[PDB]
Design a protein around this nucleic acid. Sequence first.
RNA 1: GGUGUCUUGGGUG
Lengths: 97, 267, 48, 49, 178, 294, 111, 213
Amino acid sequence: IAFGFADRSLPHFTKDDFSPESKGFVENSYLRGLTPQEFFFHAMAGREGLIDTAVKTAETGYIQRRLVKALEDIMVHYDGTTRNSLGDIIQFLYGED
Amino acid sequence: TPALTVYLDREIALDIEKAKVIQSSIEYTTLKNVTSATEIYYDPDPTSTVIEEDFDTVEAYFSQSPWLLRLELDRARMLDKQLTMNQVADKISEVFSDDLFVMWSEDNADKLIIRCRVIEEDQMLKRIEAHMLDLIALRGIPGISKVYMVKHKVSVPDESGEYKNEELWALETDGINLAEVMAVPGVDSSRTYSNSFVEILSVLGIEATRSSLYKEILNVIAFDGSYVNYRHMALLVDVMTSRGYLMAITRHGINRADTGALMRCSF
Amino acid sequence: EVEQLLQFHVATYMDNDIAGQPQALQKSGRPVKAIRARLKGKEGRLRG
Amino acid sequence: EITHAISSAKEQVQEIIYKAQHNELELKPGMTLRESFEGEVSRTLNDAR
Amino acid sequence: GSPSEPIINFLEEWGMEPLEDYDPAQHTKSTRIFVNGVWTGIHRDPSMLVSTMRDLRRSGAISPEVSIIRDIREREFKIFTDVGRVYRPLFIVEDDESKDNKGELRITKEHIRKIQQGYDDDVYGWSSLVTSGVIEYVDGEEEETIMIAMTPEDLQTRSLNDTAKRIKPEMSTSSHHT
Amino acid sequence: GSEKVLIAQERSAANIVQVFKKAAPSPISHVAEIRSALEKGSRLISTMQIKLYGREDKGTGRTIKATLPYVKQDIPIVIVFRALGVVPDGEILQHICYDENDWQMLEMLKPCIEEGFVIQDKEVALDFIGRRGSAALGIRREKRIQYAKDILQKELLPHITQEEGFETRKTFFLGYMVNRLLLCALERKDQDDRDHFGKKRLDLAGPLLANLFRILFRKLTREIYRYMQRCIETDRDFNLNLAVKSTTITSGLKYSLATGNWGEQKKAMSSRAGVSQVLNRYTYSSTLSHLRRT
Amino acid sequence: SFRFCLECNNMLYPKEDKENQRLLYSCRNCDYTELAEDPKVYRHELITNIGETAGIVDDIGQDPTLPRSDKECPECHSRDCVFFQSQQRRKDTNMTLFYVCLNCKKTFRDE
Amino acid sequence: EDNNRIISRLWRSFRTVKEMAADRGYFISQEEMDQSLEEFRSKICDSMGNPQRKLMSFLANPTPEALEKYSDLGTLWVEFCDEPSVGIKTMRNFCLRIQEKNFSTGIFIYQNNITPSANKMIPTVSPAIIETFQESDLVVNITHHELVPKHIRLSDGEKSQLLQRYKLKESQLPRIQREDPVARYLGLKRGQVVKIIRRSETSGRYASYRICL
RNA sequence: GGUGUCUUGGGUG
Ligand SMILES: [Zn+2]
Ligand SMILES: [Zn+2]
């Protein structure tokens, strides 16, 4: 957990405190319950996960669209070769086996 | 993050001192890396000096412009890089043959110093000082900013034919220069590999480019334990290297083919 | 002036995305749906 | 047992902090003293959990 | 939002020196005073100025929504009366280090008795608490400079062993918390 | 007949200096940016960056050049200190250096002094500023000076003051900004945090309606001018109750609150959308949350 | 550290008195030219430490956010001191600390 | 000192050049293959230690197998030039000497740079062929790299056989650039087809074919 | 026998 405040993670800590509790170690379990500081740090981490899930899916879909458009015209032919729409050879035998 | 994997010759590959010497040989150091603080001194008489330390040095170096440069070289920095005063002064004179006259204190001297002379001249000294500190090379391949002493658990057969692990020192490096590092003595020239397959294409050809491309894609996919069957990535790398050069998966790559207009427009 | 008005009307009848000039606008403030805009994009003819 | 392990890890982290503050930490290749400190602490706490 | 005129007047009264009387040959230690992002002067001694400003805000003389932000490493004193700042209330721990009342909450059971009654004993609501100096507002910038106890029990370190209740943190690195 | 709620708008604070790092293939490395606004009206006025040209080990000239509004090319800093009325480089440095003992900052200030050594008086530097004011071609020097002097007086830190005879205060703020720039450039302080919530403001119904009403009322006054241009020609007394078309402000407020597009109707594009939304009355907590959204 | 002109209040630049071979300093605005004391004409540093202990003020004891340590003050044997790490912000800097006593305001270290 | 390094690099380049010539089909004496660093220094260097690059220049004739197979394989000339920078003068002399003694192919290894004016004489000297390499490029033999499989140029008849077996036109083959380091190393001309046998983790062995651009 | 077009905001997968 970065020092979002000046030299501390939260305003309930002192400056330049590198202990596990200051920088986001949650000592409790879910059964026992998180403290307010631990609750906030775990919320930051879950928010990071939600942002990642929301934002990476667009890059992934773009990548898969580009791959499909690049490889869409490639078919195994009756002579065993793997050719594109221009008839150009990509592999003389599919998968080399 | 460009990086090489420099396999060493077997005799070196087991010994650690030899591997460290090769490491020192491959890494790039500039005069910045061993310099503490540079001055500019007015020294009106070449045969004399206004300074009180280096008078003996130049009286022992004897038996142009009055502008002097007195740059200092820290001790431990030389010690850790196996660098002395002699090699540094030789390298400076190698590229500053006759437009510069160099005085240098000795290595055992209580202060490690270098003095230079020019042959209003208060700004050519500044330009020369900047250009020396920022362009004088000492040893190694330009483009290799860091070198690491890494350990690889290769599995090779024994003299009984049974496969046994074997613990060898190899090299990893920041930055990329495949052709020049491949030439450096002590390196297994037949096994150096780069993570930039454009470099592979420029140096080793297109088939090696295909191999490197498959290796990178397999690494990225199988990083987390996912397994994609071989033939799919083989097809993907065969499409990218079929024309003889690297074809990117973009409009700039896909739309330079000879296919019909309707395919290209549909994308 | 009038021939250039003709040139501009003919141009924006076909392509209303010309760099470095205003766009042919409609009464409501929206730009005109040119033919190129009909043909391009996720919602254009080819992909939509 | 669990709380003893967590206390042991807190003591280890405090010792790493003392070593870093008194200039005694062992650096790693391609890695800064602060990045080495952070990597060692993260290793310690992950193994504690 | 709030007018900046009373802030400037108090600063001029209490000792702020102007920038038309500025000479960096002498003023190597002086602290510069910003009001709404405008540098308006310098002071020889920010301590009593910030103390007096905080007492004025906690007495009602200054608008309760006015930021009073001292910076110590940067030798700055920033007062904000801007509109649009987000703020939240906190209890005020007695911090004057001179009386037995030091280190515990200024709010007591008399204040809660008055709040339940609904009037003072010669309407007592939230604003009366804010103006009596037991709760104040802090925005994000002022939050940088304060030391907030998480719960009223955290104001004192306890000497337990409850396998069910969660361990309230040790807070051992710091010898004495203020 | 439709319930509408105004969503609070989040914006960076005003009148604060922030210093930013830059990217590797950029000659500019460090940028101090300040936006200026007045306590009355709370409206933006002008923006003024102060960039640090020269990369690490590249871009040999490590000068610092401001970027004044209404000028095309970036002026060196000593030039603007001279245009504001402090020519001697000693006074510029002293306005910059509070502590003579420090040496690194004074060592990083020389290339600026060298690139702006030519000027020695206020008029010539202020013309150098004037030659860039992006105006028409061929204005003579004596009034090019007036245009540039106007830029140096107003549109240069309007929050400080826009009246004449107080240039020293603007010079002092320039010195403070330069010092923060150098502190960020010399690694003696970390770069300013864009996401810090103390450096942000929330615009509720008040300021939003203030902005929209200001726009629409200047519209109304332009209509009043364009009517009093005609009717006065007739040389008649007019009672002004037929001179104001009241439907302009009403239609504008209603259009903005009913569509959400915050701006004039013909500028729906380039205007913020969603400022106003249909109040969610599906359940009680949804209403309570929607009324407190940002 | 280059000085400034005693008359024109600009800055003096180096030059050479070829008839005496002594480094003067020439005003590029006025004609005044004085003798100098220090024959250094330029300086450059990369391993610097200005800002090591400089990030301290007199009233740093008044900061209620600084963590307080139990180190003994070498000066006044005071058992209460606030402490902090290097205010320098470079990447390779140490994590070694600095220690400020609240009694004498003398800075000390754990060395 | 640095002289040892220069001599060693030159000897490595010479060994690479001889391996190139033998790979391309020319006959090389078994003794000149195993040329050692010290024996090279003996036959080339001086009392002062500097090397005579005019003695490394050799002459190669087609091996009878590479004549029965590649009927268009003539005689090879390989020259290490002495001028670090090379201008139109040296290329003029080289082309005059190559046409003067009807050498089919001329490999021109240079040190520093080849100026464009000199570079322009390479294609206008038909029917001979002139190729150039830089010494820095020749230090490592890239065909010894593990990632570079063995390339074998097809003959005209075998290229025709390949095209008819697959019912193919030339433009429907995978391709290799004329500037490819392994195409440059092999002296591939436009239209010639290499056969590339390579490791296959699914089938063991796989033969690929590329045509030269 | 024939139930129109575009943007803004809030959600579901
Ligand atoms: Zn002067
Ligand atoms: Zn003390």
